[PDB]
Design a protein around this ligand. Sequence first.
Ligand SMILES: O=c1[nH]cnc2c([C@@H]3N[C@H](COP(=O)(O)O)[C@@H](O)[C@H]3O)c[nH]c12
Ligand SMILES: O=c1[nH]cnc2c([C@@H]3N[C@H](COP(=O)(O)O)[C@@H](O)[C@H]3O)c[nH]c12
Lengths: 213, 216
Amino acid sequence: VHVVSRNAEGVIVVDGKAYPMAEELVATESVIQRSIKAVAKQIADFYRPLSHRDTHGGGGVAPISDENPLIIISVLKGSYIFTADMVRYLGDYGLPHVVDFLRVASQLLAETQFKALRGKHVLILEDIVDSGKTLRYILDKVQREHQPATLKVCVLADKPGGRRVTMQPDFVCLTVPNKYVIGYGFEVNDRFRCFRHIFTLRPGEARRYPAHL
Amino acid sequence: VHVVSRNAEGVIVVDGKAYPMAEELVATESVIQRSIKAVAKQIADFYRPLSHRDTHGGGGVAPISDENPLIIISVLKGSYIFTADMVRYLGDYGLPHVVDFLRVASYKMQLLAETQFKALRGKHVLILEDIVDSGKTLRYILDKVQREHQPATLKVCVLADKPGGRRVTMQPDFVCLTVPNKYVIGYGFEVNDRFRCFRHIFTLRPGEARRYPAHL
Ligand SMILES: O=c1[nH]cnc2c([C@@H]3N[C@H](COP(=O)(O)O)[C@@H](O)[C@H]3O)c[nH]c12
Ligand SMILES: O=c1[nH]cnc2c([C@@H]3N[C@H](COP(=O)(O)O)[C@@H](O)[C@H]3O)c[nH]c12
């Protein structure tokens, strides 16, 4: 049970901690973790029956295994906390997998280092689908460079009211309101990512830290 | 609570799960998490009262704050799970901080991925790293960060210290756990990217080190 209240300044307090930058609470840690673990079970149940290119034993097709694991691509920097939690739940459910990272910014800043993804099942882990443009860019790049057998996306958050292009992730942990979200990886110039809960940001507060880090 | 035992095949079992690649258990999840949170308190207590360059007001110096946070550089890939947990404990203790990433590798050391932060001059910088073993990886990182960013101070926090592996002087400022002089796996520690998702840290059976020879 989380304790959620407001102090005399009208500021949201969760478990004794004040969040003056927040407009509303979206999800507590308990709700977020339960939602991630539920999707981890969906992911493990979906992939464990599948087979793909055998690079351990010299061809042809073999079951997903520790020898030929599911390939996971995590999008830095936003998905790193979500990924750390998800992979541990995937391990709990016994899904063989390995993780590489790509970094994008608003440009590709860092490329994946994995070089044998041809004919492999590949799952992208991303923080949020809002407009859909970021994931359309990533999916196109990953498909053209790696030629995977299949390419799917799991997002922590879906903001369905923000779409500008068609983008429907295969796995969604939580739905967020049509507002700027902060906490659990979600940032304002790298601030707020360490919050264990997700909140909506007070309007105009997205310009609070103008200085480039 | 955790139950650690061996099954009829002599294989380590933790909470009903078998780890046939493991020689010994080093630390359970509960011990690891307790250790990380304790260091988080040390880090917060150490940096909370300090001041450094003010880039928010373009001013001279100002306290560590959300306006001028502690700068954390996390070393990929091994430190990402440790970092995700540490930052949440650092937030619990109210330490203002931001995180960027660098990645290094050996062929001799070379940078695989650079940090994107460009205003670290006169700032307190903390490196988060998975393990100090020989010390060569961190000596390379510290020398590069120091010359290229010219921070006010540069310190290192490691999840693990393998004391007997040292070949160059390197004692991190903060150490969560001490490990035996053996190859460790779990909680970010890998064998060709396998085993990183384990919630516990184990030593590796020596015959398992070359189980996954194919490049990913
Ligand atoms: O509500 C939000 N809070 C915090 N970040 C974002 C983003 C960021 N923009 C990227 C996704 O963009 P989109 O789907 O709009 O192209 C995310 O990876 C985040 O970097 C969109 N919406 C949000
Ligand atoms: O026992 C170990 N288990 C898993 N990885 C390592 C490493 C890796 N080598 C790097 C640092 O080693 P060193 O201090 O010897 O230069 C770590 O960041 C790890 O990625 C050293 N020892 C170990």
